[PDB]
Design a protein around this nucleic acid. Structure first.
Ligand SMILES: [K+]
Ligand SMILES: [Mg+2]
Ligand SMILES: [Mg+2]
Ligand SMILES: [Mg+2]
Ligand SMILES: [Mg+2]
Ligand SMILES: [Mg+2]
Ligand SMILES: [Mg+2]
Ligand SMILES: [Mg+2]
Ligand SMILES: [Mg+2]
Ligand SMILES: [Mg+2]
Ligand SMILES: [Mg+2]
Ligand SMILES: [Mg+2]
Ligand SMILES: [Mg+2]
Ligand SMILES: [Mg+2]
Ligand SMILES: [Mg+2]
Ligand SMILES: [Mg+2]
Ligand SMILES: [Mg+2]
Ligand SMILES: [Mg+2]
Ligand SMILES: [Mg+2]
Lengths: 139, 260
RNA sequence: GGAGAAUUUGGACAAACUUGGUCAUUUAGAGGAACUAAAAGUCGUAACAAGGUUUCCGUAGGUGAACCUGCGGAAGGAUCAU
RNA sequence: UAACUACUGCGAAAGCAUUUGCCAAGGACGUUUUCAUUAAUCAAGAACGAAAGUUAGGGGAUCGAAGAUGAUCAGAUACCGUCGUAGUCUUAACCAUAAACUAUGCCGACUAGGGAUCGGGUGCUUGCACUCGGCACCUUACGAGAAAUCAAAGUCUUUGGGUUCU
RNA sequence: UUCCAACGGGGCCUUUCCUUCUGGCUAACCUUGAGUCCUUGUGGCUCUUGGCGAACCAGGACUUUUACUUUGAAAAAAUUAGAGUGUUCAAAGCAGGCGUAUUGCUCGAAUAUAUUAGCAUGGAAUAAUAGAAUAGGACGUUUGGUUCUAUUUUGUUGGUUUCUAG
RNA sequence: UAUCUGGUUGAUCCUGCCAGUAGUCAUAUGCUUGUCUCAAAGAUUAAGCCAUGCAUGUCUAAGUAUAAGCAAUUUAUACAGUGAAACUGCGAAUGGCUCAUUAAAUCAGUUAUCGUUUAUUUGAUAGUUCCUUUACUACAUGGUAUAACUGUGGUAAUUCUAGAGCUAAUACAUGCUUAAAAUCUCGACCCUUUGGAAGAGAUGUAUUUAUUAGAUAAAAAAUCAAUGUCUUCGGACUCUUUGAUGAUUCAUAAUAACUUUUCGAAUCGCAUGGCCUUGUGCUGGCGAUGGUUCAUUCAAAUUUCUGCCCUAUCAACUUUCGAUGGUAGGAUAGUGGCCUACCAUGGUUUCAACGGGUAACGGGGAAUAAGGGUUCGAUUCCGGAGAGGGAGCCUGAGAAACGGCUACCACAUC
RNA sequence: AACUUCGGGAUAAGGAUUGGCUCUAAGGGUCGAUCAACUUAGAACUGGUACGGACAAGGGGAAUCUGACUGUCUAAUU
C-alpha cells in the first residue's frame, strides 16, 4: 500500500497528468507490451505501484536469455532468489552430477512465494547481482 | 590492448584468401572501409595472389598509384582497400571488369563481366529508418546510405544501384520463390530458391533453401542475399552456379578432364 | 583590460614509513628421545614342536632385557566327538 | 545361579539361565482387516557398547594384579606352593575399546538333493505330513576359488540388480 | 517397365488433438461453358461458377515441466585425420599441368572430426514431473447481473448515453 | 597401434611389489660425428642486475620557405626549381618481449547493449550565421604573437636554456557571407462584424529541460463545445497522415524557452575555358585538406549461460568502515553499491561456500595412445597481464602508457 | 596472546574518542486531551586541534625461586 512511502515523490517520468484538463477518469498510467508472448498482468495496468525496474510499467527492456527456476527466497524487497538445478556430464564416468546455481531476480509488484516456478528475462544490470526480471508466474 | 591493432599475422588471416604459410609472417590487414574485415578481399590479394599481375606488394602500389584500378567506379590508392561481395573492380588497361562473387568452396572467384553489367551492383538493405528532417534512408550491405527510397522497400530486400549516380534503379522484395546467394557459413557460395522463413522472436530467423538439384539446406537470415526471381539472376553468376557437388561427383568431373 | 606564474583552502585518490595484529613459507639450536643401515658383539631364551607355563586380543600392574601376572575374550588350538 | 544345559532359545550388538509379581517392548505365524510407495543403503549427526580402568558414596564372602613369602634354578622379585592390597558386587557419573570373529557389510532376486530341530499354522486318525519363519547340519558341485574350502565365498573377461565402508 | 520382395517413410479409417480460430488465396481438383485430347480402362485432360483452404502466411487467443536422442547450425587459422599433386625420393610445400613454348590455355588449393554449454529441428520408448476428492473441477449456442475496454460513424477535435464488438 | 619377462620356495600355486622393455616437438649430460633438406635455442634458477650501440619517426602537384643553402638558364619585381631548419599535422596506444601476478578471476564456446564511446575508412549530409534587418560591420579577404634565423650570455655537467631583436599559418584568436515561401505569435487601423488586415518579430544545426504527436479489434447512429464546412443550404457533412521492433518514453517531427552559444570552409594545387558590360566584369573544370550530424568500418567497454588443479590437519563465510536489496542523488561514455544519504536485513554454503596451497597465466594444442584413459601446454596463433616495486597523471579518438611525466620505496650512474 | 583447575588470565597487550553552542531522535504517566523525569544515540556550527582542561586517577610485558589461595604474628629494628 501507500506508494508514496519514500522521501522522494514516486512517478513514471515524462508522464504528465495535467490538473488543467479536469477529468475524473484516472491518472495517466503508462505501460508496455514486454514482448516474446509475455502477457502484461492486469495488476500492472490497473494497480497504482511505481517501479522503475518493472518490465511492464518501467524503463527496463527484456532481451537475451529467458530462464526458469524455483523460488527459494522472498525476503528482499522487490527481488527474489531462484534456484536453477541442472545435471553436469562427467565424460570419464559416462554419468552426471546434480549441480545448481542461484540467480537473484527483480520481481515487479505486478506478481510470488517460495515454491513457485517462474520464467525470468534478461535485462540491463539492475543491481550488483540482478540481471533478470520476473516475466511470468506458474504455480 | 590500449588501442586498435594495425597488424594481422598470416595464420590469423581469413582462410578464404588462400595465402601461403611460408612466404611471409604478416598478411595484408584490410583498412577500415565498406565491408567487414573477415568478409573482405584486399586489393593486394586480388591483384597479386588471384590475378597474378603484381608479384610483390611494391608492384601492387605501382599499379594503384597509376590510377588504373577503380572499385565501384572510383579510383583507390590503398593496397589494403576492403573490396567485398558484389563489388565491381574495373581496370582501365586490359578493359577487364570483374565482380567479386563467391564460388561454391566459399572463396572469391575471378569472375569477368561485360562493361554493361559493371554499371550496377546489388545491395542487401540492412536497416531502413528516418533520418534528420524526416528524410527516410536505407543502408546497404556495403554501408551506402541512400536517401528517399521506395516505401515498399523493407529490411532484407536487395536493391540495384547505379554506381555513377548511386541511386535505386530497381529492387527485389524478400519472399518465397526468390533466388538467393548465401554469403556466410558452411553453405557460403551456394545458390538456391527460398522455400520458407522460420520466425523465432528475439532470436535468429532461418531460411530453408532448395537448389536446382533438389538439395534443401537451412541458413540464418543474416547469411542470405536475394539476387533475383526463380531462374532470373540479376547479375551474371560464375561457373558452377552455386550447386555444391559431392567430393565423389567432383572427382568424376575431373576424370572427364583427365582424358586429355 | 582579458589572459595569467609562484603561492594557497578544503577534498577525494593515495604511494611510503613507523607500530601492533594475523596467515603462509623457509631456517639456526646446547641437549633429549627415537628409527634405520643391521646381519655378525654382550646378556639371556620370549616365539616357532603341548617350544618345554598352548599361543594371541583388549585392558591393568610389575620391570636389565626379551617378558611376567590378573580380569574378560578368541582359536588363527594341542579338542569339530558322550 | 550347578546338575537339567543341547551343533537348543531370545536380543541391534555387547549380552541374557533359581521363583513369583508389576511395567512397557518384540519377532514369527494367522488374517477375503487398513493406508497406498510411505521404501533400500546411507557422508554429517546420534543411541547402545564385554573386561579392565577412573571419581565419589555403600559393600567387602571368594578369588586375586601389585606386594609379601617357601621352593625350584647359574639366576627366577617366573611358572609351582601359602598369604594378600586394588580389584572382583552395587548406586551416581565417566571411559568407548576387544581375536567387540562367522576374522565373511546391508537390501533384493535366482540357482540342488537330504534329513533332523525351534516357533506358529493347517490337515488329520493324534504322530506323522504339509506349510511359513528361525538356529544350524549332512551329501554333491552344477558353479566358484591360489588353495584351504564355499548352497554362498555361486549366477564375474559370456565382465552392469541397488547401496555404504575399507 | 510392371512384378518378385526385403527394408525403411508418410497419410487415412477403426469409441481416435491432427493447438484454436480470424482474413490473405482459394492454389488445387468429384466445381464441368466445347467429353472422348488418350501405351494394358488402377502405366489418365483442353477450364467455367460458390467452391473443400492443412498447400501457405501474421493475427489476437492460451499454451504442465524437464531429462534423453535424430538432423541442422555452430564450435578462427595452424595442428590432427584426409583427397589431389613425382618437392629428383622423403620430411615438407600448396603447388602445378597441357599448347603452335613466336605474344596462351587450364585443373587446384577439397573433405571429415571436435561433446560438456547455448541455439533451431524431428521422435515421444525410457526416467521424472503436473492435473478434478471438503470439487473453488470441465465443456456451453444457455439465461441474468457486474466489470471495464473503443473501432468505421453520428462534419471535425471535444463533451457524451446506447446498439455493439471483444 | 589389444604381447609381457627376471626376482620370495627344497619344489609349487598365489597375492604383491622391485627390476627389465618401448615412446617422449623432454630437458641435461657423456662419448662419437662425412653429406643434403629443415630448424628449436637464457622458459625452468634470478619478473635478478645491466657498460656500450641500436630498436619511431614522418613530405606530396596540393598547410608554413627571403636558409645571409644549393642551383640556376632565363615560366615572373610577390612567390614559383630542388630543398636543411623549425612551426603545423599525423604517428609514436601498433609491433616486439615476458609469464610475475592471477582459481569463477583469466580464458573457451555462447549471448546482450531497448546500457554506451569510437581517430580513421566508406556512404550520406549544411541558401536559414549580420541582429535594429536605415549606422558601419573589411568579405577584392579581418587581428597579434611566435618558432626556426641573427646577435649577447650563463653552466663542471645533460636531447639545460635566459635576455634582446625579426617574421609565416590548414597554429592561435576573431568575423561577414546568398533563393523564395509558409507558419506562428505580437499587433497599427475600423467595427461591434459567424469581423481582417497592414508590418513587427521569430523559425538552420548543436546544447539543456518541460510538454505534444508518434494511430489501428470489425460495424451503427444518438447527443453537440456547436460556431467550422460548403453555399444544392434542410447546415450535403466526405476525404483525413502515421516508419521500424519480439518489445520502448524508438526513429523522427512539432511546441515553449535555455546556452562562460557548438558547427555552418578568411585554406591549398593543377588546368585555364566561356560570356563582353574587354572592367581585371560576371560565370566556370579536375581534387587536396577541412568540418556538423547520421550511417558504416576498425575497434572499445560492460555483459548472459555453462565449464577450472590439490586441500576439511580449512565448516561456516559476508555485514564496524557496502555485505545483499530498496528509494533519491552524485559520478561515468554509459549500466550497476561504482560512490553518498536514508531505509530494510539480507547474500553464499556439504550439489564443498569461506580459507590455504599451486615448482597455476587461460585456450587452440602436445606426448602416449585397442577401447576407455593418464600426463604436459613458460614457448610460433588467439585472449589476458606487466614493463625494478607501488600509486598518481598529462597528452590524446584511444594509455591509468613506462624506449611519457610526477612522487615515494629499492637499486644504481656522472 | 600464552597458559588454564575452563571459573579465569583480563583494565592482558594495544588503539581511537571526549569542550562549547545550536539542534534532531528514541525511550513515559493520567483521564484523543493533559501532565512529567532524566538517560542514550546522532547531526550542524565553533576555537591558537583545545577539551576526564583544576581536582581526581592502573605503568606494562617475557620468565625463574618460593608459599596453593583469603587469613595470622615478633605493640617499640624482621
Ligand atoms: K594472604
Ligand atoms: Mg601489444
Ligand atoms: Mg621358549
Ligand atoms: Mg611357550
Ligand atoms: Mg559416521
Ligand atoms: Mg579395533
Ligand atoms: Mg541510480
Ligand atoms: Mg607463476
Ligand atoms: Mg601457454
Ligand atoms: Mg615459471
Ligand atoms: Mg629487470
Ligand atoms: Mg599496460
Ligand atoms: Mg606506469
Ligand atoms: Mg626499455
Ligand atoms: Mg613500448
Ligand atoms: Mg599475564
Ligand atoms: Mg588496554
Ligand atoms: Mg601465602
Ligand atoms: Mg617489630
Amino acid at each position: 500500500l501507500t506508494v508514496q512511502s519514500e522521501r522522494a515523490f514516486q512517478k513514471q517520468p515524462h508522464i504528465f497528468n495535467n490538473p488543467k484538463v479536469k477529468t475524473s477518469k484516472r491518472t495517466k498510467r503508462w505501460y508496455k507490451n514486454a514482448g516474446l508472448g509475455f502477457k502484461t498482468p492486469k495488476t500492472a495496468i490497473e494497480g497504482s505501484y511505481i517501479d522503475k525496474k518493472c518490465p511492464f510499467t518501467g524503463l527496463v527492456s527484456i532481451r537475451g536469455k529467458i530462464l526458469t527456476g524455483t523460488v527459494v527466497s522472498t525476503k528482499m524487497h522487490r527481488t527474489i532468489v531462484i534456484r536453477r538445478a541442472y545435471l553436469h556430464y562427467i565424460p570419464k564416468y559416462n554419468r552426471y552430477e546434480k549441480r545448481h546455481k542461484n540467480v537473484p531476480v527483480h520481481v515487479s509488484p505486478a506478481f510470488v512465494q517460495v515454491g513457485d516456478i517462474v520464467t525470468v528475462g534478461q535485462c540491463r544490470p539492475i543491481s550488483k547481482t540482478v540481471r533478470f526480471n520476473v516475466v511470468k508466474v506458474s504455480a | 590492448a590500449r588501442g586498435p591493432k594495425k597488424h594481422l599475422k598470416r595464420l590469423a588471416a581469413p582462410h578464404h584468401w588462400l595465402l601461403d604459410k611460408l612466404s611471409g609472417c604478416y598478411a595484408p590487414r584490410p583498412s577500415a572501409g565498406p565491408h567487414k574485415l573477415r568478409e573482405s578481399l584486399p586489393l593486394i590479394v586480388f591483384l597479386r595472389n588471384r590475378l597474378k599481375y603484381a608479384l610483390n606488394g611494391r608492384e601492387v602500389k605501382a599499379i594503384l598509384m597509376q590510377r588504373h584500378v577503380k572499385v565501384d567506379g572510383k579510383v583507390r590508392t590503398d593496397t589494403t582497400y576492403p573490396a567485398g561481395f558484389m563489388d565491381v573492380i574495373t581496370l582501365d588497361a586490359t578493359n577487364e571488369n570483374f565482380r567479386l562473387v563467391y564460388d561454391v568452396k566459399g572463396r572469391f572467384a575471378v569472375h569477368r563481366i561485360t562493361d554493361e553489367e559493371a554499371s550496377y551492383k546489388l545491395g542487401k538493405v540492412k536497416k531502413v529508418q528516418l533520418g534528420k528532417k524526416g528524410v527516410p534512408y536505407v543502408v546497404t550491405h556495403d554501408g551506402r546510405t541512400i536517401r528517399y527510397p521506395d516505401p515498399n522497400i523493407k529490411v532484407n530486400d536487395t536493391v540495384k544501384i547505379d554506381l555513377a549516380s548511386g541511386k535505386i534503379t530497381d529492387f527485389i522484395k524478400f519472399d518465397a520463390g526468390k533466388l538467393v546467394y548465401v554469403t556466410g557459413g558452411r553453405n557460403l557460395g551456394r545458390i538456391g530458391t527460398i522455400v520458407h522463413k522460420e520466425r523465432h522472436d528475439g532470436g535468429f530467423d532461418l531460411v530453408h533453401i532448395k537448389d536446382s538439384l533438389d538439395n534443401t539446406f537451412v541458413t540464418r537470415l543474416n547469411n542470405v542475399f536475394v539476387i533475383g526471381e526463380q531462374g532470373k539472376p540479376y547479375i551474371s553468376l560464375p561457373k558452377g552456379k552455386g550447386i555444391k557437388l559431392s567430393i565423389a561427383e567432383e572427382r568424376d568431373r575431373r576424370r572427364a578432364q583427365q582424358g586429355l
